[PDB]
């Protein structure tokens, strides 16, 4: 999810010598925006060279992220928390539910046939 | 209350090698002893003797030994994480600035030059080993520090090897059989830390069958008559046809230390500002004193 | 200057796609980027697009391809979700090898091909969450799609009774599986293996 | 504010009729003081508290959405002066001259308010019903939200005679007098009709012109610029843009209609 | 982006402080920099993502479910935490006649003392501030918070809230310690818990349990290691349990009626 | 057991969602269901009267470019092959 509505673009002076800004989120954009400090600045080379060194940037920002989604919960998990849905959750419900559809309408087309061809 | 629970390397009145403040190690160590070692006496007298892992291999989890435990596990992490250092060759820390957008500085490593490592240290075989168990020490050297930063509370970060070299060797009656480990892998501690597995069934099914094996009983009238698990029929597998098998394969969940990290406030806050625990992790794993951890590698199959 | 705004312009951080927004063709990495609108806005039938999205839409995830279209109106399908399959694949828990990381974790002037976990994975490869994973529960096809991932069901022996209790409603019944593990062709597609306990 | 309100009593378990209370003093009192988001956008705001005409800017417009223009495909050449290039199939307006066109049309209502103007927003797309119904409510201007009845103006003696007329002061205080049968019944002109969507509402402008009153519209990438005495090159579908330009000029009216009942308190 | 919200008079606690809780210091550990921190860390969190135009307490409660949110939640709630205990920890002295307040501050309220004699089966509020630090002591390994709740059943309870556990949502209060194995009694309520919420919600409606808190007492480390010390994080306990602004706990009791 | 119209099999590798397993999935799909093609001299082929037995509806006709749909150049000149190959014996 990206927050492309943009907000009072006005107060959005943004250091981006770091692939991270208060208020903006974490997006490919950031890593655009950051890649143009290497090439303006000329901290790497040419604009190849200067993607990738905050392409491994991302990344890392990413990795630290995913295990920080992790702990959140496992911690959580291990420390009296109780959960009424997960993403398994809505996974299987939803789908369940679709089943409902799906089983009743074969129950008119393979049946329906039989009559259409008996 | 003896200093039997410590090492000289960890000296009184000494800014930890600027890591810790001359009383930092106090607040993270000895005045913690202080009122840790305190409960350990108020909790038994086998202390002075038997070591923690007694009390606490002693009992999965003790209707009394609860509150003992968590002293017990505390202590026991501490040796664990706070030998395997040797002081990062730093001036104690300033206060890492207004960090979060400050901190992410610099690379997070993930494919920029390692440094204090098994390697440096003469480890090579182990070096392998963990380059063979996490990707590589680069790629083993970031999920560490990263795996303490996602604390949020008092908690350890752990790397051990899990040795399951072959099931049945106790009654197999090996006592040289110095535990063969098969891989290695990370996990953590918080509060009061245990093996790992999420002890899954470790205290699940012994809990679980507890209170289910009382539904029966429970309906002390009957049983709830002809209606039976029902709603619990599939969940009754909560443990029976998964956490049962989710308590690793068939029962022989086993973990084995060699690098441990602390992720609580009292370790890091006192120089590393309010959020240095990156900095604090940086100063760390340029401080690990490695030949204790292959000291503490066990052979591999 | 008017293009530097436009060239931060949200507008221009979503990158230009015509993929089709039905896409018939076997799908395995996302076509188009979702458009995340809060509540408020919803009420407000605001979605930043040149066009309103209609109040038919109650959605707060839409995926556009065109601001506006000759025929006067944006092209939108409000059916933009991904959102749930990738979260699926964190609630699954399971890393890719992804070939050899030298170097890097994922190793690769540009890295067209061999892109990587393809944002789908940003976590160190071994953990203690493995505890044998936690059996996630999946559809099978026969495969089975686990969190929106098909992976092939492997049992100790085949159970024929355990089909025959689902009948034809195999893909309706969802079994847990104790995911074996997956992998990121350089198509990038995902190819995994499920544990039927039967 | 609560008259059916029967406090449970002693042992009861809280009423839910006032536990909803409890949430109500949970909010207005202690609410989110904690951690309180800021430098934030809402759809709450503009309609509400908008910009003095003199304090917009290019960037303000840009992020209410005033810029993105029709696609380059429906451009009615008549601007090839008020659009700034292309983009994405769309053609993004010059707001440089946006900001022009807004500063001016701003002063026409603000003035216009300053002499007992009658001012009548008009819009029709879905969503103005509120934007336009406030709008004049500062002004106390009047809005039309639904389409445009064709032949107000114009044909006003009969599409518009069944309405009844107040005697209203300089205050805008209704004189509570009565209005003579013929008095009431002729035409109430407005002095300044606002559209917020001419690409389908000319039957209004068209009517206006021939109605010798001055109109003040959004024109877009293919709106007429033209039919219109103050075009505003504006983004006519999205609504935050819409509610931020017609909130400027709102406002515009607001301090007029402030500077206006303010001459009459000095007698 | 969120902002730290400005105490009472920070003017003295820039360098002068809650008179016996704490001078300067403290708060600049914990409001002038922890509460940034973390209220940097959400806004980072929140960037991009609708979980933001809402006030964190308000995503405190919306980020319940999905746990994979959890990280941001946890935070969350420990902002909110925060700032309930500052309130509780607030000198929020009065103003007006120019000379500094003479601090009559209203001790348990009027109506405060049935709450806990209902509370607590008959008992005296003060009797609680020990055993509050009896649980607290008791029912903590590492971080977390004190909390007096009232609930629907108006017995303004106290709850073991840990960590940064949400004292509203039941199904997340973090009062078992998973780490320290517990009682299967305990387990009952798990029991229960994984029951009582697996239907409430199941309606689309997660348990709608209007225990609200009411005193918060941090008891993460910069609560009492930063600096109090460590056995002393009962003594920090102490001073702070000694006296509590009751302006704030006054009105965090559904006391009146309104509309 | 059951009829094919009636049932996805979307194959692993591809990501299966809750609508994606429904029928009106199924009905959407169906609406939405060459090295000439790709660049080469399609008269070059005069001869090889196998290449140019392809776009051929089976009875010595050519398709409207409805089917074939290839370049208005290289359909012409596939055309001109097949009418060229009926002159060089084979086809």
Redesign the interface.
Known sequence: PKILVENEIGDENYDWSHMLQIGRPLDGESVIQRTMYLIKTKQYGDMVEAYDHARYEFYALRMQEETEQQVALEEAEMFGSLFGVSAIEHGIQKEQEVLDVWEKKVVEETELMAARTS | YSTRYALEHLKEGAPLKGLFSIEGLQKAWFDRVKYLDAKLNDCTNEAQQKPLETLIHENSKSASKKHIVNYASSLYNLKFSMSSLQGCIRTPPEECPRLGPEALLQTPDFNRTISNEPLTTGNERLQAALISSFGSLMEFRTLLINSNLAISGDGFTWLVARRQLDKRAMRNDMPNRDIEYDKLFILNTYNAGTPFNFSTSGVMNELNNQYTNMEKQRAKEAGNLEDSEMTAKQAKTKFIYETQQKGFSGKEVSYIPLLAIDASPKTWLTDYGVFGKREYLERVWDSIEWKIVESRLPQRT | TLAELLGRSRIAQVANNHKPLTYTGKKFHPTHQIIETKPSTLYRQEWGLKSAIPSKIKSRYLVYNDLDTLERITTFEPRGGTQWNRLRFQEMGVPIVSNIGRQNPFFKKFNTEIIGTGGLSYSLPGKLKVIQRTVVPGRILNLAAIGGFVADVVFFQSPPSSFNSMGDFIRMKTFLFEILEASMEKNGSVSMHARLLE | PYPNLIPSANDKPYSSQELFLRQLNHSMRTAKLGATISKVYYPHKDIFYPPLPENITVESLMSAGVHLGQSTSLWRSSTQSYIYGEYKGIHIIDLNQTLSYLKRAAKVVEGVSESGGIILFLGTRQGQKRGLEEAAKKTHGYYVSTRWIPGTLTNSTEISGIWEKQEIDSNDNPTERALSPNETSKQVKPDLLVVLNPTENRNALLEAIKSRVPTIAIIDTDSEPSLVTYPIPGNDDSLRSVNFLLGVLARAGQRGLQNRLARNNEK | IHVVPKLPNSKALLQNGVPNILSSSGFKTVWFDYQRYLCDKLTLATAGQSLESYYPFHILLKTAGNPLQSNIFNLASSIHNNHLFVENILPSAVEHGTNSNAVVKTEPSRLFLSKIKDSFNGSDWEVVKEEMIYRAENEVLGQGWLFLVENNEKKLFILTSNNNGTPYYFPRNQSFDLNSAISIDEFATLKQMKELIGKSTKLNGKVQDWTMPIICVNLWDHAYLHDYGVGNRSKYVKNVLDNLNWSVVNNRIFSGISK | ???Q???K???????????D???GRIH??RK??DIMKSGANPLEFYARPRILSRYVTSTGRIQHRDITGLSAKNQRRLSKAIRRCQAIGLM
């Open positions: 057991k059951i009829d119209s009636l049932s099999k979307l194959p692993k590798g591809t990501i299966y969602d809750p609508f397993f429904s029928m959407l799909d939405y269901q």
